[PDB]
């Protein structure tokens, strides 16, 4: 246990028997956020559970030596699962021929991409990602249909456009079930 | 649509043993969207396990869920007499949220032969034009049994229905009924009404018959 | 304490309609999704309908689409299931259920209610006909037949006789009327010494019959 100077960090770290090979480590910050890490026979990270201030966790399990592993993000009402690589993390939601990918870079840059394998020029879905607004805009038949704003509060919000795609209408609703995300990609 | 298949159909174990319940999915189900449920007869189902690991605030440590991907298993370490209910595997990721066909966890006891009794139709019932002959199988195990009706030494089919009780709460036994429904006109042109019973605990088939009068 | 009470079911003709009600207490109704689950007689569980917290999003199974509607009232802490164009295959015990997955922890269906038995049939209400079953160990019984709908409760000697009593589950005859037998296993020496009363109770038809069985 090593507490930082500003009395804000509680680094619950445990050594195996001597002080060379790490085993487990938990660091709790002031803003209710923790980063649990587990290690292997070598000393490279095996699991990495990171908790944000709002309670949404980003859990990494089964980290291999090459830098890969299993990825899953737990949220209020639904979870997003995927894979981590030494490049970036991808979280995948699939509905029919449409696959939605959420990308989290090693620098924290969140990216969202969409792909539809249908070859029809009408029903195929395409998306454009806005970095500043953090909204994925789904386009169908060269007209905008839905807006997918990914809030900094770790939630997915959908706002629908009009019949011509000129502007969004009504109010933007929040997603509380995984089936809702699948319904948006149909 | 994801289809869940449960194996076995029924599992006959004694109390104190270990019961392994497996649930198969037609596709890959995420480990975060699978649940196990228990339904005792005559009552609503109860949530046992969620996330394949969480025990849902009040379930003892005997119940344990495991598995991933296609195959999921639920194991009860040390069985207790109240654990012999019907168990269901369910996924709740994508609609429709489908349940397994169900597994009946039955108490396994020593094989008991039935006590067979035959009841002639009531004289009051004959005035209504219908005659009901009932053959009762009492306090046997296992539930599986064969009952056939012989009228004037002739096998009968299509005129008999069977009802079975559930496993007895005291001695873990089963009882069976077999009613032969036929008209009074058909009843009065035949003399001998027999009931042949075959069972695992019966070394030889038993027959109970009566004559009108 | 968390619990749910269900109401609205009953016996209706094919093509009819009825409304289910689920009263919720002991928990924040506004924060949870809700579901309808039915279970056919002697069959497995089948999910029926689902509703969002605010009721904006509703999902149904393929079979009940265009006939069933699920709504809720957060203020009244209630939830409903309108069931139009009822078919015979809709006969099941409909369980109102709380989703449970309302937060970060993934939870299955947390809470289940007692359920309401809806029966879709063209048969009218029927009163049972009770006939005695005359006989080391002797057997006696009462046979109730041609009654509709379920259930029927049978008691021997006004509940005094309980050991060795077997009330068999009702079987559906070809006429659409239920039929079951209640039997008692008693020592053969008890015959004549003891008098056996069998009491059947068909609440739907308000039928009270006490039948006496003697060896003859
Ligand atoms: Cl998915
Ligand atoms: Cl139960
Ligand atoms: Cl083991
Ligand atoms: Cl079953
Ligand atoms: Cl059988
Ligand atoms: Cl249909
Ligand atoms: Cl509504
Ligand atoms: Cl979870």
Q: Which of B107, B135, B159 is the endpoint of a domain?
A: B107
How far is residue A130 from each of residues A70, B162, C89, C137, measured CA to CA in Å?
27, 68, 50, 85
Asked if B9 and B31 sit in the same domain, the reply is yes
Q: Which of B107, B142, B167 is the endpoint of a domain?
A: B107
Asked if B101 and B178 sit in the same domain, the reply is no
> For residue A5, how many C-alpha atoms fall within 13 Å in the half-sphere facing its CB?
0
Asked if B36 and B92 sit in the same domain, the reply is yes
Q: Which of B107, B128, B144 is the endpoint of a domain?
A: B107
> What DSSP state is assigned to residue A178?
H
Asked if B37 and B79 sit in the same domain, the reply is yes
Contact C52 A176 (CB under 8 A): yes
B207: CATH: 2.60.40.10
Strand boundaries in A56-134, DSSP class E: 57-61, 69-74, 79-84, 88-95, 98-105, 110-116, 125-130
Reported as type and span, the H/E element at residue C18 is strand C18-25
Asked if B124 and B98 sit in the same domain, the reply is no
Classify C197 as helix, strand or coil. strand
Closest alpha carbon within chain A to C59: A179
For residue B75, give the ligand nearest its CA.
Answer: 3
Look at residues B1, B112, B153, B124 and name the one whose alpha carbon lies nearest to residue C143. Answer: B124
Residue A46 CB-density burial (10 A; 0-12 exposed, 13-18 middle, 19+ buried) = buried
Are B46 and C108 in contact by the 8 Å Cβ rule? The answer is no
Which residues, including other chains, have CB under 8 Å from residue A179's CB and lie 6 or more apart?
B93, B94, B95, C59
CA of A105 to the centre of ligand 1 (A): 21
Are B74 and B36 in contact by the 8 Å Cβ rule? The answer is yes
Q: Where are the domains of chain C?
A: 3-120, 129-212
Phi, psi of C200 (to 5 degrees): -100, 145
Query: Which of A143-180 are b and which e, b meaning 16 or more Cβ less than 10 Å from the residue's Cβ?
Result: ebbbbbbbeeebbbbbbbbeeebeebeeeeeebbbbbb
Look at residues B211, B213, B129 and name the one whose alpha carbon lies nearest to residue C129. Answer: B129
Select from C33, C57, C58 the residue whose CB has the most chain A CBs within 10 Å, as the one to mutate to test that interface.
Answer: C57
Contact A76 C52 (CB under 8 A): no
A134: how many CB neighbours lie within 10 A of its CB? 15
Q: How many domains would you assign to chain B?
A: 2
Instruction: Please name each of the domains of chain A with its CATH number.
Output: 84-184 (3.90.930.1)
Class of CATH domain C3-120: mainly beta
How far is residue C68 from each of residues A78, A145, B174, C50, C85, measured CA to CA in Å?
26, 29, 40, 11, 8
Phi, psi of B100 (to 5 degrees): -75, 165
Place of tokens 């496993």: B167
Look at residues B155, B152, B158 and name the one whose alpha carbon lies nearest to residue B187. Answer: B152
Which residues, including other chains, have CB under 8 Å from residue C6's CB and lie 6 or more apart?
C20, C21, C22, C94, C95, C96, C113, C114, C115, C116
Classify B125 as helix, strand or coil. helix
Phi, psi of B110 (to 5 degrees): -65, 145
CA distance B65 to B57: 15
Are C38 and C61 in contact by the 8 Å Cβ rule? The answer is no
Q: Which domain holds residue B181?
A: 115-211
Are B172 and B109 in contact by the 8 Å Cβ rule? The answer is yes
Phi, psi of B113 (to 5 degrees): -75, 145
CA distance B102 to C46: 12
Neighboring chain C residues of A74 at a CB cutoff of 8 Å: 104, 106
Classify C191 as helix, strand or coil. strand
> What DSSP state is assigned to residue C108?
-
Look at residues C22, C23, C50, C24 and name the one whose alpha carbon lies nearest to residue C36. Answer: C50
Are C22 and C5 in contact by the 8 Å Cβ rule? The answer is yes
Asked if B119 and B102 sit in the same domain, the reply is no
Per CATH, C3-120 and C129-212 having the same topology is answered: yes
CATH pick for C129-212 out of 3.90.650.10, 2.60.40.10, 3.20.20.70, 3.30.300.130: 2.60.40.10
Asked if B137 and B84 sit in the same domain, the reply is no
Place of tokens 């990825």: A71
The set of long-range contacts for A158-161, using a CB threshold of 8 Å and a minimum separation of 24, is: A158/A184
CA of C9 to the centre of ligand 8 (A): 36
Asked if B121 and B35 sit in the same domain, the reply is no
Which residues, including other chains, have CB under 8 Å from residue C201's CB and lie 6 or more apart?
C152, C153, C154, C155, C207, C208
Strand boundaries in C137-190, DSSP class E: 137-147, 153-156, 165-167, 171-172, 178-187
Reported as type and span, the H/E element at residue B22 is strand B19-29
How far is residue A175 from each of residues A136, A156, B18, C54, measured CA to CA in Å?
15, 6, 41, 12
CA distance B99 to C205: 36
Sheet holding C68-73, edge to edge: C3-7, C18-25, C78-83, C68-73
Asked if B44 and B126 sit in the same domain, the reply is no
Q: Give the resolution in Å.
A: 2.8
Contact A180 C57 (CB under 8 A): yes
How far is residue A158 from each of residues A97, A138, A151, measured CA to CA in Å?
20, 11, 11
Neighboring chain B residues of C134 at a CB cutoff of 8 Å: 119-120, 122
Are C140 and C131 in contact by the 8 Å Cβ rule? The answer is no
Pairing of the two strands C11-12 and C116-120:
parallel
CA distance A61 to A58: 10
Asked if B82 and B155 sit in the same domain, the reply is no
> What DSSP state is assigned to residue C169?
P
Which residues, including other chains, have CB under 8 Å from residue A161's CB and lie 6 or more apart?
A143, A144, A145, A146, A147, A167, A168, A169
Residue A132 in tokens: 């500043």
The set of long-range contacts for A102-105, using a CB threshold of 8 Å and a minimum separation of 24, is: A102/A73, A102/A150, A104/A58
Asked if B89 and B174 sit in the same domain, the reply is no
> For residue A10, how many C-alpha atoms fall within 13 Å in the half-sphere facing its CB?
7
Q: Which residues are bridge partners to C140 per DSSP?
A: C184
Asked if B121 and B97 sit in the same domain, the reply is no
Please tell me which chains touch C, using 3 or more CB pairs under 8 Å as the contact test.
Answer: A, B
Total number of residues shown for chain B: 213
């Amino acid at each position: 246990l090593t507490i930082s100077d500003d009395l804000g960090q509680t680094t619950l770290e445990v050594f195996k028997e001597d002080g060379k090979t790490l085993v487990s480590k938990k660091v709790t910050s002031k803003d209710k956020s923790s980063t649990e890490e587990k290690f292997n026979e070598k000393g490279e990270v095996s699991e990495k559970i990171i908790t944000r201030a709002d309670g949404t966790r980003l859990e990494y399990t089964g980290i291999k030596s090459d830098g890969s592993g299993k990825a899953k993000e737990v949220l209020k009402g639904y979870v997003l699962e995927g894979t981590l690589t030494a490049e970036k993390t991808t979280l995948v939601v699939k509905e029919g021929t449409v696959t939605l990918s959420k990308n989290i870079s090693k620098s924290g840059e969140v990216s969202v991409e969409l792909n539809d394998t249908d070859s029809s020029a009408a029903t195929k879905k395409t998306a454009a990602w806005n970095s500043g607004t953090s909204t994925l805009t789904i386009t169908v038949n060269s007209k905008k249909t839905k807006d997918l704003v990914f809030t900094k509060e770790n939630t997915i919000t959908v706002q629908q456009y009009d019949s011509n795609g000129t502007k969004l209408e009504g109010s933007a609703v929040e997603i509380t079930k995984l089936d809702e995300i699948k319904n948006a990609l149909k | 649509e994801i289809v869940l298949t449960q194996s076995p159909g029924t599992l006959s174990l004694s109390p104190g043993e270990r019961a392994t319940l497996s649930c198969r999915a037609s596709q890959s189900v995420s480990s975060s969207y699978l649940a196990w449920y228990q339904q005792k007869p005559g009552q609503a189902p109860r949530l046992l396990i969620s996330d394949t690991s969480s025990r849902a605030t009040g379930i003892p440590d005997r119940f344990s869920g495991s598995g991933s991907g296609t195959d999921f298993t639920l194991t009860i370490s040390r069985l207790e007499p109240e654990d012999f209910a019907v168990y269901y595997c369910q996924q709740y990721g994508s609609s429709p949220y489908t349940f397994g066909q169900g597994t009946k966890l039955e108490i396994k006891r020593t094989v008991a032969a039935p006590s067979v009794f035959i009841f002639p139709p009531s004289d009051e019932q004959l005035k209504s034009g219908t005659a009901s002959v009932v053959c009762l199988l009492n306090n046997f195990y296992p539930r599986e049994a064969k009952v056939q009706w012989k009228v004037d030494n002739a096998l009968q089919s299509g005129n008999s229905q069977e009802s079975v009780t559930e496993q007895d709460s005291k001695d873990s036994t089963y009882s069976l009924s077999s009613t032969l429904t036929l008209s009074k006109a058909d009843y009065e042109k035949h003399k001998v009404y027999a009931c042949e019973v075959t069972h695992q605990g019966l070394s030889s088939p038993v027959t109970k018959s009566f004559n009108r009068g | 304490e968390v619990q749910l009470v269900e109401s609205g079911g009953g016996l209706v003709q094919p093509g009819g309609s009825l409304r289910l009600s689920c009263a919720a207490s002991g928990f924040t109704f506004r924060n949870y999704w809700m579901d309808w689950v039915r279970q056919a007689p002697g069959k497995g569980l089948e999910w029926v309908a689902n509703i969002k917290q605010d009721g904006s999003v509703k999902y149904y199974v393929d079979s009940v689409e265009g006939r069933f509607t699920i709504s809720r009232d957060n203020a009244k802490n209630s939830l409903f299931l309108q069931m139009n164009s009822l078919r015979a295959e809709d006969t099941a015990v409909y369980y109102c259920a709380r989703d449970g997955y309302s937060g970060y922890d993934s939870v299955g269906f947390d809470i289940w209610g007692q359920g309401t038995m809806v029966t879709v049939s063209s048969a009218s209400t029927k009163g049972p006909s009770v006939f005695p079953l005359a006989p080391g160990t002797a057997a006696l019984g009462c046979l109730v037949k041609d009654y509709f709908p379920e259930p029927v409760t049978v008691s021997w000697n006004s509940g005094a006789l309980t050991s060795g009593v077997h009330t068999f589950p009702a079987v559906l005859q070809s006429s659409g009327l239920y039929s079951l037998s209640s039997v008692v296993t008693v020592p053969s020496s008890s015959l004549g010494t003891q008098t056996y009363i069998c009491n059947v109770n068909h609440k739907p038809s308000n039928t009270k019959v006490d039948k006496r069985v003697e060896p003859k």
